[PDB]
Amino acid sequence: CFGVTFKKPLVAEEKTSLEPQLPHLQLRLPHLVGIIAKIKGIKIEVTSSGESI
Amino acid sequence: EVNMTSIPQGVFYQPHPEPIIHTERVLGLSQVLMINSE
Ligand SMILES: *[C@@H]1O[C@H](CO)[C@@H](O[C@@H]2O[C@H](CO)[C@@H](O)[C@H](O)[C@H]2NC(C)=O)[C@H](O)[C@H]1NC(C)=O
Numbered sequence: 001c002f003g004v005t006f007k008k009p010l011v012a013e014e015k016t017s018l019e020p021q022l023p024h025l026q027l028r029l030p031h032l033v034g035i036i037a038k039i040k041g042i043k044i045e046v047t048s049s050g051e052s053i
Numbered sequence: 054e055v056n057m058t059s060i061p062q063g064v065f066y067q068p069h070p071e072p073i074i075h076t077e078r079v080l081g082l083s084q085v086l087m088i089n090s091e
């Protein structure tokens with residue numbers, strides 16, 4: 001209109017959510033509980049010698 | 054010693070390295086951040 005140009009109003013997103021990126025250390029000692037559980041049950045068997053004889 | 058140069062018409066030029074924007078219009082907006090730890 002005349003010399004000036006008119007532009008439409010811009011709609012705005014109401015909310016934003018922040019989810020930052022985190023470094024991944026990738027440690028291996030955690031989630032190894034099964035090995036500890038296996039260590040718990042060694043179960044060495046010893047039979048008395050001389051009771052039979 | 055000294056170093057010399059004669060300005061021809063008494064007009065010199067300065068670098069002036071900052072930009073010049075020449076704004077057109079100003080807008081206003083609203084927004085919510087919603088910080089959550091979950
Ligand atoms: C949290 O634990 C999850 C699951 O172990 C990790 O997600 C894995 O990430 C690796 C590396 O990018 C991928 O190769 C796997 O496919 C992912 N698995 C799943 C199920 O998503 C996640 O990286 C861990 N978070 C941190 C910060 O270490």
Ligand SMILES: *[C@@H]1O[C@H](CO)[C@@H](O)[C@H](O)[C@H]1NC(C)=O
Binds near residue numbers: 055056
């Ligand atoms: C000033 O002039 C001398 C010679 O007259 C020259 O050796 C020197 O480099 C000059 N200094 C400048 C241009 O900064």
